Amino acid sequence: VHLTPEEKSAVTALWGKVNVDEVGGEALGRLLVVYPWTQRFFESFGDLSTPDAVMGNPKVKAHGKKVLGAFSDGLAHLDNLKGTFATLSELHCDKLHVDPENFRLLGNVLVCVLAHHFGKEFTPPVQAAYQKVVAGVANALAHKYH
Amino acid sequence: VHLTPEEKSAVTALWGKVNVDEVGGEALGRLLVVYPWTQRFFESFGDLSTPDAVMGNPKVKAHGKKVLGAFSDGLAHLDNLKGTFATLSELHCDKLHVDPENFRLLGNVLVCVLAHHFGKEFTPPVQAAYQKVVAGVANALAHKYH
Amino acid sequence: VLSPADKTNVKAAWGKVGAHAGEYGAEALERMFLSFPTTKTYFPHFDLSHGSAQVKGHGKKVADALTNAVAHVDDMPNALSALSDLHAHKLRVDPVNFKLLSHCLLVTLAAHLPAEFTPAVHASLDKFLASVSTVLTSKYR
Amino acid sequence: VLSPADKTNVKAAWGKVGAHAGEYGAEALERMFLSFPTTKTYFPHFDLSHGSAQVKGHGKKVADALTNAVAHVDDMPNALSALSDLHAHKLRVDPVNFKLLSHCLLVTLAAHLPAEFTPAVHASLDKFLASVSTVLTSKYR
Ligand code: HEM
Ligand code: HEM
Ligand code: HEM
Ligand code: HEM
Ligand SMILES: *Cc1ccc(-c2ccn[nH]2)o1
Numbered sequence A, B: 001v002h003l004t005p006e007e008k009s010a011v012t013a014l015w016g017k018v019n020v021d022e023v024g025g026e027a028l029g030r031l032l033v034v035y036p037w038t039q040r041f042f043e044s045f046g047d048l049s050t051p052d053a054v055m056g057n058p059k060v061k062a063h064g065k066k067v068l069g070a071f072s073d074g075l076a077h078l079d080n081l082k083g084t085f086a087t088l089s090e091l092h093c094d095k096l097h098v099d100p101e102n103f104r105l106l107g108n109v110l111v112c113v114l115a116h117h118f119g120k121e122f123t124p125p126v127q128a129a130y131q132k133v134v135a136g137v138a139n140a141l142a143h144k145y146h
Numbered sequence C, D: 001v002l003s004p005a006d007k008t009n010v011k012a013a014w015g016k017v018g019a020h021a022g023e024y025g026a027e028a029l030e031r032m033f034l035s036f037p038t039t040k041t042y043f044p045h046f047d048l049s050h051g052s053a054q055v056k057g058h059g060k061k062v063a064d065a066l067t068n069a070v071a072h073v074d075d076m077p078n079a080l081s082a083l084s085d086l087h088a089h090k091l092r093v094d095p096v097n098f099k100l101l102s103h104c105l106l107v108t109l110a111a112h113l114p115a116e117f118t119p120a121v122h123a124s125l126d127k128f129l130a131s132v133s134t135v136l137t138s139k140y141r
């Protein structure tokens, strides 16, 4: 993925403020609430039966934190997303059989959560840079399908 | 690059009986009729205003012949679909900006056309082998998006 | 959204299914399970072997539900409410799977009713099955 | 299919836009044009520079149409028929672009209305925009 140096600084500056305890769990939680069929991949996470239950679920928060850390690792290796995510792509494609459209949905849910947390700081140019990142992450996740 | 040997034998055997002059125009025509936004990519082709006008359009039939030629090229190189379609991927993705969901739709329209022509000979196992072909073709055409 | 011509096309073509309901439904299920094996995991306790009586009986249920949907094409949320309870609330079926079954239904119809499966009718059947799929995958209570 | 709760979620959240209709609609279009440059090809006659007056005025038309859709949430095919004629019959917009704009509208709402944009309301807004999108990409006349 090609960010301009101006885009890279804006992305990096925003990401450095991200609440790593909550943002990932809110993104995974919203995925589970807005696209309920994704709950089928998380049968062992306990109570997913209501929106409040999903968002407050400690297993959702803990797993979302891992998601966010995967995005953080992608941000730090934009030149080699395919190799950064090869292990995760094997997991999500060969083992879990996640439909790659869901990779895209989760990336866009993350964008909504960033907009939600940062308000007007999440400008259209900042979003545009983040859309290049999440498209790049989602494609790397899907590589073992290609 | 992964049809089984039995799937390759099935697709090869059926494709030997396919009318290379008709099936492509029928598939492209039905794409334009069933998914009418695809007509936007063919502004210069003339009358596309009704099902009968689409299926009777000489430019649609002639283009459909080129489509099917490229599918034939893919079927002759089932383990290298990416290389077979590399140049078409640049055209469709970089130049024409066709959303790759449309590649999957055309693939399944072709499967419907095969089903329509062969009837009970288009058995479930024959279909399943062809689903891997058209999925591979669509993935190959989308490669420049990957 | 279906046009009047869409509704006319769907009723005429699906009316030609008739007594072949269970047969075409079971064939479409078998085509889906074989073409898209991940769909089998929605049925973990089924006998999905070729020609299984269970899949025969299930294809009959699918086909009959579609006949019901055709009869209520202007009232599908009300008419299919129990099926939405099952597929959207309990099973939480990924809508991509409804695209797979819808395609396999069109493949089955094209293979058995070639004279009926015109481009215009194909187009209308696709929209109809997309509409049914939206109802079954949406939680609207 | 929208539940009774979906409808009241949408009316409450969209009702907060108020006098920000043009600002928010224009912002959603700007986000779309900047994040997904291929969408610009539907507006070749437009001035699409940032802060363009043409984009601002167009953003207001979009917002107001959504307001009208919210008011007619139980009969959208009827209320939105003119917009379907434009987007499906004349412009032939690929449905993927409706997903892009819908996403950018959600982003705009999240950025401006954080108290409104709860997980359940986010879910209802997504279903609402998807249903609007289906009407505008369907040829049902
Ligand atoms: C698109 C970006 C995504 C990223 C960056 C991501 C990241 C991750 C990470 C880091 C793990 C932990 C793997 C490990 O510890 O070995 C994981 C596991 C998992 N992912 Fe994702 N994921 C993504 C999309 C998805 C989606 C869309 C789904 C399903 C709808 C999904 C389903 C799962 C499941 C079921 C697990 C295993 C949870 C468990 O341990 O039970 N992933 N993912
Ligand atoms: C998925 C399998 C597809 C195959 C194998 C295929 C194959 C081809 C071939 C062989 C050509 C001729 C290229 C040349 O000689 O320059 C072509 C051109 C073209 N294709 Fe496709 N195509 C596919 C899908 C699509 C789809 C889904 C669309 C649009 C929805 C599309 C839009 C076009 C257009 C606009 C042209 C240029 C036609 C012209 O104006 O001359 N293609 N394609
Ligand atoms: C045209 C679309 C569909 C129709 C009309 C349809 C209709 C039906 C009907 C009538 C039943 C039986 C309900 C009952 O026994 O009370 C059923 C059950 C079921 N359907 Fe579907 N269905 C559709 C799509 C799908 C898809 C795409 C999937 C998954 C890939 C699916 C998964 C299931 C499952 C798991 C059951 C329950 C089986 C059991 O445990 O007894 N359905 N459906
Ligand atoms: C998703 C919800 C959408 C809504 C509510 C909407 C609403 C509108 C409205 C109200 C107009 C002006 C109609 C008039 O002349 O009074 C319009 C025009 C237009 N729309 Fe949309 N639209 C949507 C999606 C899209 C998308 C996704 C695209 C393309 C990416 C698009 C492309 C256009 C174009 C090209 C025009 C004509 C502009 C002009 O030349 O005046 N629309 N739309
Ligand atoms: C009512 C309905 C079902 C599917 C559609 C459609 C046509 C084009 N895009 N979506 O409309």
Ligand SMILES: *Cc1ccc(-c2ccn[nH]2)o1
Residues within 6 Å of the ligand: A034, A035, C134, C137, C138, C139, D001, D002, D126, D127, D128, D130, D131
């Ligand atoms: C009525 C409707 C249109 C789209 C949806 C939906 C529910 C979950 N995902 N999409 O429902």
